[PDB]
Symmetry: D2
Amino acid sequence: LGTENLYFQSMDLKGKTAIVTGGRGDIGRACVLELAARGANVAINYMASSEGADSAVAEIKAAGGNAFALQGDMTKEADVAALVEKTVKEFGQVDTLVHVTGGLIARVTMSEMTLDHWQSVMDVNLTSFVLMVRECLPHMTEGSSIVGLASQAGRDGGGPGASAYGASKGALMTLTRGLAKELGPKIRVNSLCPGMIDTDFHNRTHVANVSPVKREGTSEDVAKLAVFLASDDAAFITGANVDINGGMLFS
Amino acid sequence: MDLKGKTAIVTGGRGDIGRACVLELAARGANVAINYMASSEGADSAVAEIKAAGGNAFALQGDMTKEADVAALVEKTVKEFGQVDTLVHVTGGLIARVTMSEMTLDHWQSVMDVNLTSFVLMVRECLPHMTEGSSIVGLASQAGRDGGGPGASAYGASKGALMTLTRGLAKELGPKIRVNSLCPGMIDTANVSPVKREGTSEDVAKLAVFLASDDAAFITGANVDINGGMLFS
Amino acid sequence: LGTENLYFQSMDLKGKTAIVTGGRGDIGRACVLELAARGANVAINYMASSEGADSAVAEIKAAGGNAFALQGDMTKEADVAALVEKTVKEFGQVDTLVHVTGGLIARVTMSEMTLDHWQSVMDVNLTSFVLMVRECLPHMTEGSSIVGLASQAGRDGGGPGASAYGASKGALMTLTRGLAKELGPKIRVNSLCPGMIDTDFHNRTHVANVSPVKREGTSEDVAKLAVFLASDDAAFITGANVDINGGMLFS
Amino acid sequence: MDLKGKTAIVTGGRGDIGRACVLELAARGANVAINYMASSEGADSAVAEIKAAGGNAFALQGDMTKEADVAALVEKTVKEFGQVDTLVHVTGGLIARVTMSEMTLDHWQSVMDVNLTSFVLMVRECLPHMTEGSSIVGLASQAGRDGGGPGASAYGASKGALMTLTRGLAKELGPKIRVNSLCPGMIDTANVSPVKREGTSEDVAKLAVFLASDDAAFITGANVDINGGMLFS
Ligand SMILES: [Mg+2]
Ligand SMILES: [Mg+2]
């Protein structure tokens, strides 16, 4: 029973259901596994290859948990609706959203800016979050949470040719605050502001060296913070945009 | 008059804060090209006041979310006055209060376009014509820092994007061009605030023209709070 | 063995040693117990009554852990030296410092300010942290961490008559950043910025009501964040000042 | 000259940034009481320049960490000029680079006193004499926002305290008195920065006098970055 108490305490998300978008990428898959490790049911969106999503589902099921994956474009209203509908049909509720959909898309200077590029960056980073939050609200429970993935770029403008990306992440940071007020006390809303993370998805040695921690971050680093913020261990934290950048920027 | 010989574009010059910026710029000697969206009354009377005092200005109606109107304003500015020394972009607005639960894409996009896309379009259009030592001033909001008021989540998001973009462009466009924005609180366009009043368009214009001027040559990438002490950053 | 794996994973601070100052107060005692719950040895400073420190030590020992308590004034160089000396003599190392010493002392307006009051507030909140960090540095290991207790007051100036308190907490916030750079990569340094917390020590209904979470925070809320930041789960977070204020302020 | 008839105290007016603030204030018509710590050469020549242009100023040597010297400066200001309309506190400094591992209480306290306690003493001394619509300008630093440079942890801490105190006093002292501070980056008293140069004392003085003036009437509790785009807030 010393065990049973340990298991009970460790599995604090047992009985709860999470949606992770962008299980598509490294940070997303790490978040999926971190949520499941504490007992959450997980519905996994991915955009392109299903390889990492399928294997995450299989790992979760082998450990006695429950998950499924679904391809979709989170900039599309129909795909957003389908993901949430299938999540509720399968699990009956939604307790947390971790939205890892996003991206730089391309490096484009303002002098060469096109509306197509600007709109595409806004939609994948910001509109996708708007759509998912809207879709989830009818289903979220007392004590629910939303975790967004912003960036250090929201705080410093971003890197060369990334001005659209920075803008979209700054918008997400502000929206996190607006929604924390609009949706509390029922729902908490927080976002992460990662620095340089070593992933398939993002795009160097400089920055690792210049950083106080002398390394790039990992997807697992980010997942630990995401799940902390999603959990009841962060019950008095809402509207926060938490820097996870190895000491490269302070706020 | 340190802006003598210099050329300013003010968008949203109809137009409480915009109109105040127009007059402050002209008072320091700038030629001013004025955009307004709808009624011309305030823009036209500003032009008449400026001309009566020996200055130069014109007013042109246009929608700053439209590429053709953005191009027309900058083209006329360059033909009448020459190169652009400063852009003060006062186009923006909440449009309507709507909760996230009932958000539509149409509304979201509209708020993004009037507050943010319009700024992108104007900066892009101005860049080839901007002088050495020129500047851009954006109009953000306290809402960028605190998320905004009830039903204003889209508006807050658009202003937060503008704040970050200010930083991004300060790096991309320096040293040739400085980029700063203002973060106004409650403007009268109260006694909970330390200053115990609402701000005025003139308060905001004074900060805008300071940031536009050479007196702010070592300030770039700033988002300056002008909110009567209601919020600190 | 499914147990043993669970125990191994849950006790991530096993073999490590923490110093908590201000086990004296609610937040401090909660931090003590949260650290011990994950396996840390804990050395506990308290200023006045030993009641809560003694009972924490007894609870930890009953659960198979190790801790001791020691009265001391963390504004005094001799007491600071004695605490660290006794910690190292007992446990052989120091892996984390959680510094909960601090306080408003009294409400004093600037017009009525005295150097005595100003100095007293600076010393209990800021100088005490300087002394403890300095004392710990010869003993800290690869992968060590420091957690300070700042305040929402550092970000907004604080409440009526609390201008000295706010100043001391803003200093601590900045110092957190300076030390994250000076001491990394060996040591991470982060602080918490709590809003309204329901404790013996702090000093109301307004603020609870006005807050997005519609309540005051608890000592346990703060302890969860403190131990997250002290742990390897925050390995890519340094120089952060994390808001835990129920959504009353955003940064 | 909008500061005609108004009285300013500048501490640290010896004194690169301080001296520049003195001249900028006098150029807009202010009477200026000038503190300097040691050599009088820069303060005295500023007084002579101001007087030669028909203005009014005096210079008084004193240590702004000492209660008696703080009292003497404010007393003489009130006797010669009357009530205080603005305080620009430029007293401060790094003193020395020292790592935390080798920190002494003496050094820590010295840095706190010259940067922070001095400001506390001057504000307290000025309060009974400050006018309706008066202002305080502190000199913080980029170091308050990023922790400061190598061996400067004490200096950063003292400037971070000043930034927060600015907010606290903006609330406590409003609406009668506005309180703002400056957060300068590298001042020449570089090509990594967006503006590709170091700042000048004059850059800082222009911002200081803006914040001291009625042109900043709706700005209080601000800590304004003036760092050439090296840091954003
Ligand atoms: Mg020039
Ligand atoms: Mg007045």
